[PDB]
Design a protein around this ligand. Structure first.
Ligand code: AMP
Length: 220
């Protein structure tokens, strides 16, 4: 069930290409100054590219965003589709930070993202959703506001779900909102869940939201 932790020689030598990342995305990494993959990237990317669900035990600073963004963008290039991936976050700040990385990696290949968070007028958000972005990065309550109230908005097309900082999502009282979202997305999708630790509450969510996941743990 557990991913192979990278050892010192592998940290020193692995490339993004070695992980299976397509050439145009290897170039985007270089352009960002991502010249070596992090350990969570080395663990999760090949498994995700093979189509495995992922549970990542990792925190900011580990490179967890690239560990899910790169496989999502790789698949998007293979099979372009709007409303392709949803990333859920506990906070609006993390949503903007994740969008910065998707835009940095994907803007030049034409990938469109939309951030859907509190503190922003709903009419700009409804327009952004009508424009059918490839990626939506949202906090759970604001996403449900749009699922309930924004005409024509739904997640039936989704191929990827990410729950980033899932321990914090649950600790911030979004259990019901997450459960509601899980009811109105497709079962046939790829899913990532990242958390700083495994707890009973996180294990309940992973058993509800992931299929045969590989556990990828790092300390840095
Ligand atoms: N392979 C990498 N090489 C250099 N920097 C990276 C790499 N992956 C992620 N980063 C940066 O690490 C920071 C923390 O990312 P994260 O741990 O996803 O919150 C962000 O500023 C990323 O741009």
């Amino acid at each position: 069930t557990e991913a192979s932790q990278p050892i010192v020689e592998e940290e020193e030598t692995k490339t993004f290409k070695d992980l299976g990342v397509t050439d145009v995305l290897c170039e985007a990494c270089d352009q960002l100054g991502w010249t070596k993959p992090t350990k969570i990237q080395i663990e999760a990317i090949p498994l995700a590219l093979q189509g495995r669900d992922i549970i990542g035990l990792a925190e900011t600073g580990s490179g967890k965003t690239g560990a899910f963004a790169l496989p999502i963008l790789n698949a998007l290039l293979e099979t372009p589709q709007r409303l392709f991936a949803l990333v859920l976050t506990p906070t609006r700040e993390l949503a903007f930070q994740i969008s910065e990385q998707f835009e940095a990696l994907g803007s030049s290949i034409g990938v469109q993202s939309a951030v859907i968070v509190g503190g922003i007028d709903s009419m700009s958000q409804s327009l952004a959703l009508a424009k059918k972005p490839h990626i939506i990065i949202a906090t759970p309550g604001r996403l449900i506001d749009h699922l309930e109230n924004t005409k024509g908005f739904n997640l039936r097309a989704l191929k990827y779900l990410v729950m980033d900082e899932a321990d914090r999502i649950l600790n911030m009282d979004f259990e019901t909102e997450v459960d509601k979202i899980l009811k109105v997305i497709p079962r046939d999708r790829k899913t990532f869940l990242f958390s700083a630790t495994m707890t009973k509450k996180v294990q309940k969510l992973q058993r509800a939201a992931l299929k045969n996941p590989v556990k990828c743990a790092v300390s840095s």
